[PDB]
Design a protein around this ligand. Structure first.
Ligand SMILES: Nc1nc2c(ncn2[C@@H]2O[C@H](COP(=O)(O)OP(=O)(O)OP(=O)(O)O)[C@@H](O)[C@H]2O)c(=O)[nH]1
Ligand SMILES: Nc1nc2c(ncn2[C@@H]2O[C@H](COP(=O)(O)OP(=O)(O)OP(=O)(O)O)[C@@H](O)[C@H]2O)c(=O)[nH]1
Ligand SMILES: Nc1nc2c(ncn2[C@@H]2O[C@H](COP(=O)(O)OP(=O)(O)O)[C@@H](O)[C@H]2O)c(=O)[nH]1
Ligand SMILES: [Mg+2]
Ligand SMILES: [Mg+2]
Lengths: 436, 430, 61, 71, 439
């Protein structure tokens, strides 16, 4: 009787939603047609993501938004065309073209109304709605603009309902565009006061992980989407599978965010080994939990060794045992290179689930009987904000590219308040990080 | 005949109840269908203590199960012997607490309490002669720690003469599973001290320690922990259900165990426990039983009795035994350890005998001891609480629904006052 | 094929909660009445005085 | 949510199975199947290795073939 | 539950590692592919392999060693070797550029880019074990990369751990036999580094083992393979008691509890017996008395040193086979009776004996014969000052005209480090001098 609604905006959002909905469908055994797996043969878990149509097939509780029609055309032409409802794949006519102002003030407002209508039409069906998940590439104009607009609109339409934002910030040195600092800063200014929980999904760290571990020297976006989908499944398995110690979506904002202004976390997943040597090591709980805390295994390009820890939430799925988990926690605490903040004596939240991780055909990971997903709030994440701040001021010193936003309905000053909000966030982080 | 009703709440409380009812049902020889298939007279004369009789000759437990989420009861119903419980008794919320003591004690529990209060009032009024109430709950989880204490207050306001028991799972700082344990633990203890007639503490760290060292079994589990705790519950009330050389009711134990009204927190122990490999060696005798029963590591609390002085002790023996060896051994153990017994309360041990042993055993011992060694639990809990509270961490969740820091400060001060007063008698001399 | 077979004709003409009651409550024999419990016993010229006092606690109902 | 399994491998026991256990003499936490369990799962787990190995090598062939054609 | 961690650095380190690990493989019966043919063993229970290998749950056993190099030829050879399936795929760390026999390059320019990887791999290996006995390190001192990385790793491990025992099996250049032309410089620098960072050092120069294999094995064309086999046999004899049952077991902690009287003087020299070829093994008796006599001649020594020129401080003997304690004690009594060997006055008892029951194994394609008795020797004596004096003379001769120092100052290392190394080594000979004086 518990449901979560998925929102996918931006090209990256669509390309990760496709991967995650392949995985959910494979987990629940649905065929691409949306029915039971043919006539070869109902635990009632699919209700967490799917809803029964009344006769046969299942319709997912997800919505796709875009302004450029392309990706919507390919998803409507592909093998899952019959799976999704024909009128939840919202497509626009002109893209914002990396312009945050275009997607926040000019053309997205004509589509946000249809989106809210569809969101209501999906929400009224649900009865025990846990909350919303949102996916958006932040370094894109239309993605950022629509993500913002939907966040503030939902915050007033629903109020206390929880929302989780899995955003992909640009890498420190590797980037595709040249104007993404502006829209990333504006989007952060938008989401800081509107998103309950935000998670880092930078691409550089995932590229490095794929290179070192999967031994894939020519990886593409599909592998990154598969890894992110694995993270999603490890996070949301607890609601739809039996476990010894269960954690709900509501059991995150009460355990991981010490103060309301501090709600940005970074993730890690383990084990991440190529099948060519995957099981030539025992993959015990101790070694997987050490690899999880390894600084080289961060999902975002940040080094936790430069700062302290406030919160760590870990979800184990598979063949873990509470005694082994506690024994590993003791070793992690005794280790000296990892230090916690003084006002947090115990900082670990632990969840246990029995459903083992899956392998997707054509995948790269090996299907293992044990896995762990870690999400931590630590002080070290100020460095990415600092470097983006320096990049932004380097641009804004000579007021370059500012006309492209001024001429799109938004006035001159909005950059100032975004910069001030970033400064205030840094103030808060480095004030919290100091010992009493 | 001086019967008791059962109240259990939270996921932890429901899981303990699921095993305790199984143990009592097997001891009384009742199938999961509710039909008697026992062999002796003694299994049925005092069956009304725990079981109500329905049409068709079947028995139903007089327990009430509560939670703020339906999953836990919809799961226990799937367990063995899950058919016994009456569907009218189950009470559930559709939201859950999320480990927020304020949410489970002010907003959602306040509106949920009506139905469970109605059903407990009906159950209490139905039975002819009340004896008391017993509660099983965990202090680390928001729903249990809030709802159970609120219900304790409400039902104490209605039944002041009845006896009340709480089996409280106190969150240890070693095996820590959530980051908000100190807050709800302290707020639970503050309400518990005012209303609970008896409180009996169980620690998962102590359970793991005893299971690893005494049982020496490879893979422990929450099922094993519930097994131990269920045996502990059965031990205290065995003699209330069966005859014996010396009968001792819950009121009798309460009178003989608490010198002062504010000192009602106990540590318990069960004997004998032996490993599978060592079960064939040891000989079950009264000296072996008492030496294992007063062992420090056998205790189901992480507190070490030898760091403090016993205010008083009570032992319940099960099986056919002669009182001579019991009295002689208790005198000998009191004489040989004069340092650990406070001196102004001479003969500070109570003994009771029941002649019906647990099925499969001849002699068993359940021990309840009021000692000043428990102060270290509260000292470490308060230390963690003040360390996490000075910086006002994790606070707006509690303050966002009508709670203020004045209540937090009052609870901390009350807990510290309790600790200071409880250690005051440690150094008292005559 | 779990609830797809429902139709209006079958729905309304189906008693669900007031069909025959569950067993173990059927247990009264219809003809057996009062004046008939005892007045229809049989009666007999010489009674039987054998009375048994079992050493078991009497069940309470 | 639910807790239908006491531990992940073994389910709950039948009511007939729990004949005694009122006294704490049997716990079922002594397992008595630990070495057999490990030895059994590790073999099939190797099998998952070798199966993934065939998939890896097959896609490797399929990724040389097209460039061989392109030359 | 007792484990050791092995470090190989340098080409000589890798080549010694190959031999020692194939010897351990054959000793414990594990197969080169890593999958055990399975058996119920013959000594010290079935946990024996745990001392050197680690269980993956079932199947291949990962050796507890780490290989380091900057020139990828030897690492690639190992990776394509017969043990390609044995070693962990990514614990064989290889760089791109060699140090080219220059200590400065390997200690100040390109050492940091690989020391962090070595430390991380050490972390992952150390977290596996529970009762870590100690570390063993193998390196060539006359090579630039080996010397520099060994010095850096020792310095970093001394602060990463401290109290855990570290042993170092170093191979000095021979008095007249050498390959390079600048090896005295980096040898002096390496000893100046490792004097303060190594608990026990073992001298393993090459000319002496050449003489041994010439005189005993009757081989007129040996190669480094034979030398590595002898070194591996020495290591196995040293570490056998840790995993095989014996009358008097000796742990790794009972070496720095019987062999190093003072922390400064921790350089020891090791001998072995019997060392005989099969064809002439048909003659002798192979008795404990004669093998322990053979262990004492300077001609049998694997270090080019003469103990007759100085006093002995300490002696450690490791017997293996069917030795008898009474026979061992009788041998010690005869040795003490003998006059040509003199102990220092302040050490009335100077022997630490250990007994192990497992006889040594013979590798196919080897040169040694199958013998039922063997003894290993680790002695600390005053005669070791002569090698230090000789390297002092050579380094002085080469540095008199400041030759080759332009490079050493060119990679950032300062000019003066040679002087302090000279002072430290000079203090070392002086210390070894007043150690041996009689009261
Ligand atoms: N991780 C990940 N990031 C992606 C992917 N595709 C695009 N991105 C990110 O998205 C950024 C640009 O935005 P897009 O997703 O291409 O398009 P958009 O978000 O709709 O915004 P517009 O380009 O203005 O239409 C790039 O800089 C990428 O970093 C993807 O498949 N995976
Ligand atoms: N006895 C013996 N010595 C070896 C062996 N291999 C290398 N050495 C020693 O190593 C010294 C030269 O260094 P190399 O091993 O060739 O290479 P390195 O130690 O890694 O240093 P670089 O030359 O800079 O790469 C020689 O003087 C040898 O004494 C070996 O297999 N046996
Ligand atoms: N003895 C016992 N303890 C448990 C069990 N389940 C959870 N716990 C402990 O209770 C704590 C969390 O309790 P929680 O689930 O929040 O209780 P709830 O809030 O009332 O549902 C954990 O630290 C566990 O150590 C159980 O089945 N038995
Ligand atoms: Mg785009
Ligand atoms: Mg080299």
């Amino acid at each position: 009787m518990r449901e979560v609604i998925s929102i996918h905006v931006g090209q990256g959002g669509i390309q990760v939603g496709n991967a995650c909905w392949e995985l959910f469908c494979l987990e629940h055994g649905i065929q691409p047609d949306g029915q039971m797996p043919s006539d070869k043969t109902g635990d009632d878990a699919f209700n967490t993501f799917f809803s029964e149509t009344g006769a046969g097939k299942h319709v997912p509780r997800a919505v796709f938004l875009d302004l450029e029609p392309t990706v919507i055309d390919e998803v409507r032409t592909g093998t899952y065309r019959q799976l999704f409802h024909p009128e939840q794949l919202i497509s626009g006519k002109e893209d914002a073209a990396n312009n945050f102002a275009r997607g926040h003030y000019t053309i997205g407002k004509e589509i946000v109304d249809l989106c809210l209508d569809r969101i209501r039409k999906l929400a009224d069906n649900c009865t025990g709605l846990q909350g919303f998940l949102v996916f958006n590439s932040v370094g894109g104009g239309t993605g950022s603009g629509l993500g913002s607009l939907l966040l503030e609109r939902l915050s007033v339409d629903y109020g206390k309902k929880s929302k989780l934002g899995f955003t992909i910030y640009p890498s420190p040195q590797v980037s595709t565009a040249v104007v993404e600092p502006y829209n990333s800063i504006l989007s952060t200014h938008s989401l800081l006061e509107h998103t309950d929980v935000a998670v880092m999904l930078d691409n550089e760290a995932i590229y490095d992980i794929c290179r070192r571990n999967l031994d894939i020297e020519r990886p593409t976006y599909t592998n990154l989407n598969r890894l992110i989908a694995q993270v999603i499944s490890s996070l949301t398995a607890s609601l739809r599978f039996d476990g010894a110690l269960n954690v709900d979506i509501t059991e995150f904002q009460t355990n991981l965010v010490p103060y309301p202004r501090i709600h940005f976390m970074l993730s890690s997943y383990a084990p991440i080994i190529s099948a060519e040597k995957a099981y030539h090591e025992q993959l015990s709980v101790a070694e997987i939990t050490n690899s999880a805390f390894e600084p080289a295994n961060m999902m975002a390009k940040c080094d936790p060794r430069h700062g302290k820890y406030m919160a760590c939430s870990m979800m184990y799925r598979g063949d873990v045992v509470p005694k082994d988990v506690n024994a590993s926690i003791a070793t992690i605490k005794t280790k000296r290179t990892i230090q916690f903040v003084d006002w947090c004596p115990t900082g670990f939240k632990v969840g246990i689930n029995y459903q083992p991780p899956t392998v997707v055909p054509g995948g790269d990971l090996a299907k293992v009987m044990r896995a762990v997903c870690m999400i931590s709030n630590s002080t070290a994440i100020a460095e990415v904000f600092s470097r983006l701040d320096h990049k932004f001021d380097l641009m804004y010193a000579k007021r370059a590219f500012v006309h492209w936003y001024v001429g799109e309905g938004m006035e001159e000053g909005e950059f100032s308040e975004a910069r001030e909000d970033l400064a205030a966030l840094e103030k808060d982080y480095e004030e919290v990080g100091i010992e009493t | 005949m001086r019967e008791i009703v059962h109240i259990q709440g939270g996921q932890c409380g429901n899981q303990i109840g699921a095993k305790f009812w199984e143990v009592i049902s097997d001891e009384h020889g009742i199938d999961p269908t509710g039909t008697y298939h026992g062999d002796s007279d003694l299994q049925l004369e005092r069956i009304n203590v725990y079981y109500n009789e329905a049409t068709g000759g079947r028995y139903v437990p007089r327990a009430i199960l509560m939670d703020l989420e339906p999953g836990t009861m919809d799961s226990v119903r799937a367990g063995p012997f899950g058919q016994l419980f009456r569907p009218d008794n189950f009470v559930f919320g559709q939201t859950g607490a999320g480990n927020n003591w304020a949410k489970g004690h002010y907003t959602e529990g306040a509106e949920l309490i009506d139905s469970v209060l109605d059903v407990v009032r009906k159950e209490a009024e139905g039975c002819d002669c009340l004896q008391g109430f017993q509660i099983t709950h965990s202090l680390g989880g928001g729903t249990g720690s809030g709802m159970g204490t609120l219900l304790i207050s409400k039902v104490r306001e209605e039944y002041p003469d009845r006896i009340m028991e709480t089996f409280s799972v106190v969150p240890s700082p070693k095996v820590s599973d959530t980051v908000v344990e100190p807050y709800n633990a302290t707020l639970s203890v503050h309400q518990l001290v005012e209303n609970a007639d008896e409180c009996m503490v169980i620690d998962n760290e102590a359970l793991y320690d005893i299971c690893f060292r005494t049982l020496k079994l490879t893979t422990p589990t929450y099922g094993d922990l519930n097994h131990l705790v269920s045996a502990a519950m059965s031990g205290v009330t065995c003699c209330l259900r069966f005859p014996g050389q010396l009968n001792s009711d819950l009121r009798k134990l309460a009178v003989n165990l608490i010198p002062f009204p504010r000192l009602h927190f106990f540590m318990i122990g069960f004997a004998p426990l032996t490993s599978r490999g060592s079960q064939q060696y040891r000989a079950l005798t009264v000296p072996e039983l008492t030496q294992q029963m007063f062992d420090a590591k056998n205790m189901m609390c992480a507190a070490d009795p030898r760091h403090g002085r016993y205010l008083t002790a009570s032992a319940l023996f099960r099986g056919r035994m002669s009182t001579k060896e019991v009295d002689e051994q208790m005198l000998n153990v009191q004489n040989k350890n004069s340092s650990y017994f406070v001196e102004w309360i001479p003969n500070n041990i109570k003994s009771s005998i029941c002649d019906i042993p647990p099925k499969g055993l001849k002699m068993a011992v359940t021990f309840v001891g009021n000692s000043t060694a428990i102060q270290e639990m509260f000292k470490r809990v308060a230390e963690q609480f003040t360390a996490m509270f000075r910086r006002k961490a994790f606070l707006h969740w509690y303050t966002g629904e009508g709670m203020d820091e004045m209540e937090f400060t009052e609870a901390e001060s009350n807990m510290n006052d309790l600790v200071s007063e409880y250690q005051q008698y440690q150094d008292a001399t005559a | 094929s779990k609830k797809t077979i429902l139709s209006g004709f079958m729905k309304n003409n189906s008693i669900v909660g007031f069909k025959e009651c569950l067993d173990s409550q059927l247990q009264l024999k219809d003809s057996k009445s009062e004046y008939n419990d005892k007045f229809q016993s049989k009666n007999r010229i010489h009674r039987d005085t054998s009375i048994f006092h079992i050493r078991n606690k009497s069940q309470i109902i | 949510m639910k807790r239908v399994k006491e531990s992940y491998f073994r389910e709950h026991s039948d009511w007939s199975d729990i004949n005694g256990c009122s006294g704490a003499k049997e716990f079922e936490g002594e397992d008595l199947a630990y070495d057999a369990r490990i030895k059994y799962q590790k073999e099939t787990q190797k099998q998952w290795i070798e199966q993934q190995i065939r998939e890896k090598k097959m896609r490797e062939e399929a990724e040389r073939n097209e460039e061989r054609a392109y030359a």
